[PDB]
Design a protein around this ligand. Structure first.
Ligand SMILES: Cc1ncc(COP(=O)(O)O)c(C[NH2+]CCCC[C@H](N)C(=O)O)c1O
Ligand SMILES: Cc1ncc(COP(=O)(O)O)c(C[NH2+]CCCC[C@H](N)C(=O)O)c1O
Lengths: 394, 394
């Protein structure tokens, strides 16, 4: 139905097949039937109000890392008691606001954060439910930038320190430790590191309960990778089976914070061809690194599919921005295209538009959704929106 | 005067010493007195309306890469005849709009772009002034992402193809080739590659004039690096001397498109300390990769200076965003700091806030300027501005 679409909407834009979002979520929801579980969608992947609303209708939870994400989630209909707040840098304002919104719990990453939360909870006269993120010091075997389970990283804390922090939250009248948490990385293709982390944390948890800490949740975070380059993906059946075995003897509600695996595939970046240039061939498209940062930031390769029915040769698919990092795919293989032909960059639903900028003074793109029905879920930015907040200073 | 400042403004924010911008510009303006020259500030570095206005009062020009940047420049007071438009991906809309705004010239990067411009100029009944960017196939010796002078890159075209394109623009009644241009890279510390490029392009230019092409400008682009890590910088006296010698026998107006070297130093990212965390020490600050992308994108190291008068040890300075790439400086050395202490990340005036995003749902920062006088040049974004264009879809 691309024809009606290209007639009423100009490129480049993000297009989301919502069914894939609803099905991916439903798979996590059912992968855990033999137990009580909560699937907290990691907003950082994609926080569009419309998609969050779709997830809310499915009674989804939300893994937030800022007051901004918590506000989005609540505004989209997600129940506060299904909202978890992570973050190594939550500010007093964010802490206070979260406590007043009655979310599930604050996942603390430092002892100083725990003391900060206590002071704020105390002034508000409430007992703050908290979870503690531990760094099981395990290599997730992914890209260094999205690998977070090693001791080298700023996320979570070691076992000894965690044990101390927990005891501390127990004694406090303004803290209530109710959960253990861990997240070793993103875009993970190997299930061993995850399982190893589950066992180690299940051990510390068992230890925690013996010390009086009343745990009610076991949070494994997110991290399951998608098939960007046709690689084999960690099956949910094996994932769940692994975590259930790692939790032997622990009657706790399992929590998953999937992000990428929920929205990646449903989103695609539709962009039009502007020029073809020639030893090497360059296919200049109207979308750029400001719209899609993954390739340059992580050297990520997303598939490129021609949408317009039209001699296949090697070519670099590039955008309009003035930098060399602005090329979507090096040595790609496509048929000769002409000005106006449309192509789609695949699996850009996660960390796609959420990391997008206005670099080179390019307005943020139009975002469309398909619900079987094409509707706008984010209007395109006007040129004037780029400098709206700079006008008074002029 | 940091005290009055921290009393009326909350962190994190960008602070610009405008004098440094005015002096850096004046240095380029005078580095070429023995010749006619035009300094076209590359907006991509920093397009804030206030700074562009300051540059306009100094009769500065503008190197733009989008209609958005051209509009900003014009709105800030830059004369259209001092505006040059580069870009490998200009769309028909941008081309048409530029031609109607009477800018200096369009710097074309492909033969198909040249034909596209011709068709549009023809329909508007005007003779479009154009410049042609050539790829002198020279390694600028910088970071691959900002290195653009190799044949491997999508910028410019080889000599043979350029010669053909020029002849083509000469014959056309809707094109008027008036300039040759080249830009081999950014953050360049070695003056040899630049000079080598100047000589080669000066040769092709001399050749062009012999073929009837009436050249009036010689554009060397930008690219001069700054001292991020106390390295030696290419002096302007040597830069100018080199280009003048490379231009022997060519009476042309020299054009420079400096960006970084104009604004880098004048801007600083003031951020407050939230927590300290401990084998390794982590200094958690309230600014993040969404606000300053350079470290993660280019592995760039900007100096970190403590602003608050307050045992120096090794520590990773990190932001609040959920990613490992979100650390400003690895193994930095700073005194023990406490919640509330202020620090400034140096030389972030270029490609700082212009590549900033709202990732993790964090509003764009407040930008302040000093004019000896502290005034806001960009109001901070409200939480609601993050999802303003998503509300109707909800
Ligand atoms: C605490 C916590 N929970 C869940 C996730 C979401 O993981 P995922 O999307 O299911 O893999 C995270 C992950 N945080 C960082 C993800 C960085 C990805 C990067 N921007 C990219 O690949 O583009 C988390 O921290
Ligand atoms: C055509 C053209 N003219 C001038 C410049 C500006 O160069 P500079 O700031 O004086 O070095 C450019 C450069 N374009 C790409 C710069 C990328 C820098 C990167 N975002 C970073 O270092 O953060 C140009 O293309």
């Amino acid at each position: 139905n691309y024809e009606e679409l290209f007639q009423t909407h100009k490129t480049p834009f993000y297009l989301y097949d919502f069914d894939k979002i609803k099905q991916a979520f439903l798979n996590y929801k059912e992968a855990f039937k033999g137990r009580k579980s909560l699937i907290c969608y990691a907003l950082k992947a994609n926080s569009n109000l419309s998609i969050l609303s779709l997830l809310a209708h499915l009674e989804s939870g939300a893994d937030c890392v800022s007051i901004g994400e918590i506000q989005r989630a609540l505004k989209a209909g997600i129940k506060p008691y299904r909202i978890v707040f992570s973050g190594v840098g939550k500010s007093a304002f964010e802490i206070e606001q979260a406590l007043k919104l009655n979310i599930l719990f604050l996942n603390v990453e430092s002892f100083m954060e725990l003391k900060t939360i206590e002071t704020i909870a105390q002034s508000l006269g409430i007992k703050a439910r908290i979870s503690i993120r531990i760094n099981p010091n395990i290599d997730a075997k992914t890209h260094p930038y999205i690998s977070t389970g090693l001791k080298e990283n700023k996320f979570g804390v070691g076992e000894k320190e965690a044990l101390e922090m927990f005891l501390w939250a127990k004694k406090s009248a303004f803290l209530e430790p109710v959960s253990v948490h861990f997240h070793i990385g993103s875009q993970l293709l190997d299930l061993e590191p995850i399982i190893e982390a589950s066992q180690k944390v299940a051990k510390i948890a068992k230890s925690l309960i013996a010390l009086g800490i009343d745990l009610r949740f076991f949070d494994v975070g997110g991290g399951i990778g998608v098939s960007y380059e046709n690689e084999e993906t960690i099956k949910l059946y094996d994932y769940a089976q692994g975590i259930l075995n790692a939790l032997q003897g622990l009657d706790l509600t399992i929590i998953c914070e999937p992000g990428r695996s929920i929205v990646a595939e449903s989103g695609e970046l539709i962009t039009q061809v502007l020029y073809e240039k020639k030893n090497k061939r360059f296919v200049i498209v109207d979308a750029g690194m400001n719209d899609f940062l993954r390739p340059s930031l992580y050297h990520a390769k997303h598939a490129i599919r021609v949408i317009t029915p039209s001699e296949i040769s090697p070519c670099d698919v590039v955008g309009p921005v003035c930098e060399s990092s602005d090329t979507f795919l090096k040595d790609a293989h496509l048929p000769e295209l002409e000005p106006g032909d449309k192509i789609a960059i695949e699996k850009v639903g996660a960390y796609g538009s959420s990391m997008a900028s206005q670099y080179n003074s390019r307005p943020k793109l139009l975002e469309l959704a398909l619900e079987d029905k094409i509707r706008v879920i984010r209007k395109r930015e006007a040129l004037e929106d780029l400098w709206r907040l700079e006008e008074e200073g002029l």
